[PDB]
Ligand binder design. Sequence first.
Ligand SMILES: O=S(=O)(O)O[C@H]1[C@H](O)[C@@H](O)[C@@H](O)O[C@@H]1CO[C@H]1O[C@H](CO)[C@@H](O)[C@H](O)[C@H]1O
Ligand SMILES: [Ca+2]
Ligand SMILES: [Ca+2]
Lengths: 133, 132
Amino acid sequence: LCRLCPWDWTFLLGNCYFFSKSQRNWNDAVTACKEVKAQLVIINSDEEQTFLQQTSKAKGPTWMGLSDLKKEATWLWVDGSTLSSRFQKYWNRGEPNNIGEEDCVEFAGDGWNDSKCELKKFWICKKSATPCT
Amino acid sequence: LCRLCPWDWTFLLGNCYFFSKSQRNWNDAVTACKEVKAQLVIINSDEEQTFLQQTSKAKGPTWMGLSDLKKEATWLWVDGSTLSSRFQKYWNRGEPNNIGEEDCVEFAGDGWNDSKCELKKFWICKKSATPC
Ligand SMILES: O=S(=O)(O)O[C@H]1[C@H](O)[C@@H](O)[C@@H](O)O[C@@H]1CO[C@H]1O[C@H](CO)[C@@H](O)[C@H](O)[C@H]1O
Ligand SMILES: [Ca+2]
Ligand SMILES: [Ca+2]
């Protein structure tokens, strides 16, 4: 009897992803993921991005674990690592804008946006998968 | 509030996918998916193939809804339609072989094999998603 992931999480390339059904601000999103020992989703491959972008686009605007709250225009994942320049292409045209008013990143349609952290949105969690011999 | 798929099913391009935790033979997998008004997975896009293929690689070999049980070298999806020619590339090299000993298609490695239908494998089900 093999489960790679918790119930109602989706397996993808060695990790498990949870899609919220409700909506929260960016900080509470972090918390909610922390409560299940997970991280507001960090993106580390193109395939992951594509996979999340498409779900996310069918649900509505959705938070990822990317912010410039420490230092403006320096976008940091919730684990402290910097936005690799090879994901720069996933920002929508027109984005990011309102630097120092819009500090949290969301999926929106086909790409990424920056948004007011206080706004309520869907969120996604990531944590590692477990094997099956 | 918005939920595209039943609890424990995965949304992808407007369908929902269930991944079995147990193993069943091909005919029993077809049935297992009908229990919930679904079908043993049919592949109708490249992104789908890619998504299912990686999950299968973590679980074990896994049945899809393709066989040639009806007519001995024609590959038909469980819903009656024929294997489109833009999906012939997904066959592993050396596959399909043993035509007529092996009538059912499974996910194995980075492609599709034909296998003996009697064998117990994992399965996946598919039904349409529900919009928001
Ligand atoms: O040698 S096997 O891989 O076990 O058998 C395959 C083989 O790869 C292919 O050349 C042809 O002979 O089809 C057989 C069918 O065997 C099926 O069952 C085995 C036993 O567990 C599975 O591992 C295979 O994935 C499957 O094809
Ligand atoms: Ca913005
Ligand atoms: Ca074979």
